[PDB]
Design a binder for this molecule. Sequence first.
Ligand SMILES: CC(C)(COP(=O)(O)OP(=O)(O)OC[C@H]1O[C@@H](n2cnc3c(N)ncnc32)[C@H](O)[C@@H]1OP(=O)(O)O)[C@@H](O)C(=O)NCCC(=O)NCCS
Ligand SMILES: CC(C)(COP(=O)(O)OP(=O)(O)OC[C@H]1O[C@@H](n2cnc3c(N)ncnc32)[C@H](O)[C@@H]1OP(=O)(O)O)[C@@H](O)C(=O)NCCC(=O)NCCS
Ligand SMILES: CC(C)(COP(=O)(O)OP(=O)(O)OC[C@H]1O[C@@H](n2cnc3c(N)ncnc32)[C@H](O)[C@@H]1OP(=O)(O)O)[C@@H](O)C(=O)NCCC(=O)NCCS
Ligand SMILES: CC(C)(COP(=O)(O)OP(=O)(O)OC[C@H]1O[C@@H](n2cnc3c(N)ncnc32)[C@H](O)[C@@H]1OP(=O)(O)O)[C@@H](O)C(=O)NCCC(=O)NCCS
Ligand SMILES: CC(C)(COP(=O)(O)OP(=O)(O)OC[C@H]1O[C@@H](n2cnc3c(N)ncnc32)[C@H](O)[C@@H]1OP(=O)(O)O)[C@@H](O)C(=O)NCCC(=O)NCCS
Ligand SMILES: CC(C)(COP(=O)(O)OP(=O)(O)OC[C@H]1O[C@@H](n2cnc3c(N)ncnc32)[C@H](O)[C@@H]1OP(=O)(O)O)[C@@H](O)C(=O)NCCC(=O)NCCS
Lengths: 163, 168, 163, 168, 162, 162
Amino acid sequence: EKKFMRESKAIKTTRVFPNDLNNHQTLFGGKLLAEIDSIASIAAARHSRKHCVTASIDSVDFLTPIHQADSVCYEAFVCYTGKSSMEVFVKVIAENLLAGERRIAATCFITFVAIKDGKPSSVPQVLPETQEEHWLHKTGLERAENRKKGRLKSKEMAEVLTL
Amino acid sequence: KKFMRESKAIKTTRVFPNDLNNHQTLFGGKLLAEIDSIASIAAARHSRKHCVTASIDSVDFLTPIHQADSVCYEAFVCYTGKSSMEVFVKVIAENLLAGERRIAATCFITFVAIKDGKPSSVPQVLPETQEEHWLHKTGLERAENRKKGRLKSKEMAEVLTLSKPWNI
Amino acid sequence: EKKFMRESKAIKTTRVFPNDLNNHQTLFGGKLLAEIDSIASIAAARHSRKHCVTASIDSVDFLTPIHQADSVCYEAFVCYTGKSSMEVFVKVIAENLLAGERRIAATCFITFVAIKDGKPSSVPQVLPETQEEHWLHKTGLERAENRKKGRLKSKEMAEVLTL
Amino acid sequence: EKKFMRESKAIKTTRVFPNDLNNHQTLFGGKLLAEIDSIASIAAARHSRKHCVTASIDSVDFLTPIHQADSVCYEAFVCYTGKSSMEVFVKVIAENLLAGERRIAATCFITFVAIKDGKPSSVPQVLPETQEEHWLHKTGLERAENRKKGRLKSKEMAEVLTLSKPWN
Amino acid sequence: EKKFMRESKAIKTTRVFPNDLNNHQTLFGGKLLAEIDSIASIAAARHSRKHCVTASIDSVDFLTPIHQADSVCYEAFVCYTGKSSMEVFVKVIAENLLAGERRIAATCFITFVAIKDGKPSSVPQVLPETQEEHWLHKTGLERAENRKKGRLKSKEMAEVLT
Amino acid sequence: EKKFMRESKAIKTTRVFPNDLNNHQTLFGGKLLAEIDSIASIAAARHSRKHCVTASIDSVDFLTPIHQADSVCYEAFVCYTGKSSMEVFVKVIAENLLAGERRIAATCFITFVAIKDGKPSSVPQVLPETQEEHWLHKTGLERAENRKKGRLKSKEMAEVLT
Ligand SMILES: CC(C)(COP(=O)(O)OP(=O)(O)OC[C@H]1O[C@@H](n2cnc3c(N)ncnc32)[C@H](O)[C@@H]1OP(=O)(O)O)[C@@H](O)C(=O)NCCC(=O)NCCS
Ligand SMILES: CC(C)(COP(=O)(O)OP(=O)(O)OC[C@H]1O[C@@H](n2cnc3c(N)ncnc32)[C@H](O)[C@@H]1OP(=O)(O)O)[C@@H](O)C(=O)NCCC(=O)NCCS
Ligand SMILES: CC(C)(COP(=O)(O)OP(=O)(O)OC[C@H]1O[C@@H](n2cnc3c(N)ncnc32)[C@H](O)[C@@H]1OP(=O)(O)O)[C@@H](O)C(=O)NCCC(=O)NCCS
Ligand SMILES: CC(C)(COP(=O)(O)OP(=O)(O)OC[C@H]1O[C@@H](n2cnc3c(N)ncnc32)[C@H](O)[C@@H]1OP(=O)(O)O)[C@@H](O)C(=O)NCCC(=O)NCCS
Ligand SMILES: CC(C)(COP(=O)(O)OP(=O)(O)OC[C@H]1O[C@@H](n2cnc3c(N)ncnc32)[C@H](O)[C@@H]1OP(=O)(O)O)[C@@H](O)C(=O)NCCC(=O)NCCS
Ligand SMILES: CC(C)(COP(=O)(O)OP(=O)(O)OC[C@H]1O[C@@H](n2cnc3c(N)ncnc32)[C@H](O)[C@@H]1OP(=O)(O)O)[C@@H](O)C(=O)NCCC(=O)NCCS
């Protein structure tokens, strides 16, 4: 079965809470990364319609500092698939509420996997229908490959560290 | 002019039902959140200044953590620039009933000291032990490797901000 | 000095957390009511681009029990505007992450007030564009009026209660 | 058997926590409504034993602002009873801890339904004792009708959005 | 500059939340302690009308396990003073909402110190009214004495541990 | 069978979050007690290899205020035992991140009890290895005895109350 990339899209608009602020009253990278895993998993659920799990998150670069005045929106769709794997694109936009002026804060490639009876299950492939969607699709296979290599470099480090 | 031990930080914790998902397994988000949290302490101890998370290298979720396990986060500064700091964070899981332990993940995560408004000078780290040396070899390599990631991520910002047609 | 309703839309898609669950493993009304106030204030900030404050919430009727299996999406726009008030229409949909059977769990009128230098500050008027949006505006004044009445029944009660 | 209203009374007094303050440093409405559902559910629980569910909540008017320097008290008890329904009354007092000046911040009627086997269940009737327990028990049956009419619009609006039934 | 105990009484009834449950589906001891501190902190404020801090907690003995379906009532009041210190009694009662049968889960003497402008500040004296209130007042002096001592052992242990 | 103390060692270093502060920008005592219970519950499990429950906490003397700038290290390990019970020692040390001027904020003896199928359950013996470890181990007996008294005092106060 097949599924449009818009059929698994999830948005989360929210205020910045002051507990989640730091030494200079800026949002902790961690809370951003927490919001990205949660919105990203919803997309992954909508698309595969089965119980998923976070396997990897690609590198994330924090472009701009977020404040107590700012709002923060997390847009998330599925833009690639293997058999059980989903690559979810997530864009993080920070709107200053009073000033009104938006700015891009982080973008993230994050990788969800469907699981059934403890074993990974099949997921429908996603098909793009937008310039941005198309470019993501085209470029996606390259990343999925750079990731298989990355996964092995992580597993090696788990074993070196052991001994 | 400072040692990696001088910024070491350990947080050992319990897993809380609210961070379990539908399969009763810890969320990735919870883990990334604590990797940022401890890392931020490490970078603080070291720099002796207030820092901010510049970037977090990719992280691979090697194992599922359960309700009956405990998670240990170990982290220290292992590389330095002039305001930057490569923090290395190691995530050990351990069944509390059984003695079985496993590495759940590793993460390089980059903090930037800020004195007033903009980045400030942060001391250079000298490895002491064997494993502290082995993590200094790749320091210069990943630093560049990342320097290329930021610009890529910064260009994609502009494609979305300025609306540049995708191929640039 | 004017603004379309859609300029104040704000959505929050989220999962149900087991701590916000009760003895039947059902979502508490309060987490729903808390979420509604949260999403609605962003809507109220986007619109007035000023510091708003929650003055009242109309009755909510909880139509359907939300489960650990479901997501809950919260849509929120300003439908009516006073001198410094603003009615925010808030729709609460709840779909089963797997099955995919969507349903509306609650709907809520909720009244925010712009505030500056500690005293109520002016807001734009708001203009509908859709069938549903037009019915909101049109029926809006009837509601604004019942609130000026209910607020007196409320103030009077506080006074009796001191006794 | 029928209970006597003060057999299901519940008080929660509490601090105000910086995370639940506004842009203005005043308490959010949502926190208050969440606390009101919380206490009410205990009252509703004590009265009828069993296990209840929030059917609906009458409008709430936020009479006062609440500040980081204050304390808030939630007092709640069943006042009306239908067959399975329970009307909980909730009084919300704010107090400056350093002043000792107390105000009413809000009141709320909030209906609760007992559920024994995934379907509704037989709640005991509530007898009032004091004058206050008289003064708001009498107008009980009035505001219970209003809510049959409130539910109708809401249930009606559901189908308009669900079934897309054209507005009117 | 004298106040009755009822003028500091504070009550907190809560349900037991699944986060704060341990692996045996029973409440964490540290949740019970966190709550005991927060309710005792209100009482000390109610009574001092000044901003207070926690100086000590006496030993607490957890007499009953608290399960998922129980309520928990915290009842705190000031029960003995000195110059800048206030000593709050906290009785914690756990009620099974279905069975309706209560039990005492713990009681706690917790000490707060009123503090104005970086240094401890003056506090009203307390006046008992009931038998219970009178009982806890007379016995205050003796409790105050042991605190003064254990404090020394605690500051001793802090010098020697480093 | 029996384990060394360092086989139950648990460490928790942590930020001081602004929600856990009071009006004076200082850490709530009850948060410290919450953190202390949680890190000691790991030490207990690590050593017991069974489901543990807090049975009591000794008095705790808060020697230092902890400001929002500070970090908090909690260090727990088991240091006396009986049949099903385990007494855990916890030292709390407060470091000013931007000056690193460490001080001990508190120290705590907290007693946990291993539990198997409703009832208390067998737990290994603890072996000291250092001065401190040897130190706390010898004094363990006296402390176990004084605890035994209070529990009766604590049960006494529970019968006598409502
Ligand atoms: C994800 C996981 C279930 C994979 O199961 P496995 O049997 O070990 O791995 P497999 O080789 O069968 O992987 C199956 C799929 O996962 C994908 N995958 C697994 N690990 C991945 C990683 N680190 N990065 C990207 N894709 C990954 C594979 O590419 C493959 O995709 P496919 O459907 O196209 O074949 C396993 O890695 C796991 O459970 N990890 C932790 C899960 C978790 O709990 N998340 C974080 C906990 S905090
Ligand atoms: C990242 C940031 C520091 C860039 O600062 P800047 O003044 O614009 O740029 P500079 O390149 O001069 O930054 C100085 C250092 O940051 C490093 N840096 C900045 N972004 C980086 C990234 N993504 N990865 C690695 N290093 C990075 C630079 O390499 C440089 O290291 P060096 O000083 O040793 O040479 C600033 O944009 C920032 O930190 N904002 C976001 C921080 C934040 O709030 N993060 C979490 C929010 S959720
Ligand atoms: C709303 C508030 C800020 C201003 O009240 P006030 O000083 O009496 O102001 P007014 O009586 O002149 O009313 C000003 C506006 O508030 C609106 N308003 C006030 N209370 C209202 C209520 N209960 N329902 C609906 N509208 C209300 C009025 O309609 C008016 O809007 P408009 O003039 O643009 O038409 C005040 O009622 C308040 O502070 N209450 C809530 C405080 C808060 O923090 N909310 C919840 C905390 S938990
Ligand atoms: C409450 C609920 C069980 C009603 O069940 P139902 O079979 O649909 O309806 P019934 O007519 O049998 O309702 C039974 C009682 O609920 C009362 N009731 C139901 N909805 C009500 C509402 N919105 N306001 C007031 N009373 C209401 C009825 O008056 C009736 O009282 P009675 O027993 O004395 O006659 C159902 O509406 C429900 O479960 N919804 C809320 C559940 C929930 O989880 N809420 C909060 C989640 S965020
Ligand atoms: C408690 C504190 C104010 C002690 O003040 P100090 O100037 O060092 O000592 P003092 O003897 O002057 O204390 C003043 C009063 O408090 C009492 N007191 C102080 N420390 C005490 C302790 N540990 N136990 C009991 N009483 C204590 C003194 O007996 C005295 O009582 P009195 O004046 O009514 O007779 C100070 O040590 C402090 O701030 N402690 C930590 C506060 C805190 O942050 N608590 C929670 C941290 S997690
Ligand atoms: C632990 C508990 C079952 C006591 O056990 P019991 O069935 O009464 O039998 P005992 O009192 O003999 O307990 C057995 C052991 O625990 C020790 N113990 C029990 N209660 C104790 C207390 N209050 N203080 C210290 N030690 C205690 C006994 O000394 C004995 O040690 P030992 O086994 O080496 O001889 C009971 O105190 C309890 O479960 N309390 C609630 C625990 C809890 O939920 N904690 C958090 C509450 S929020």
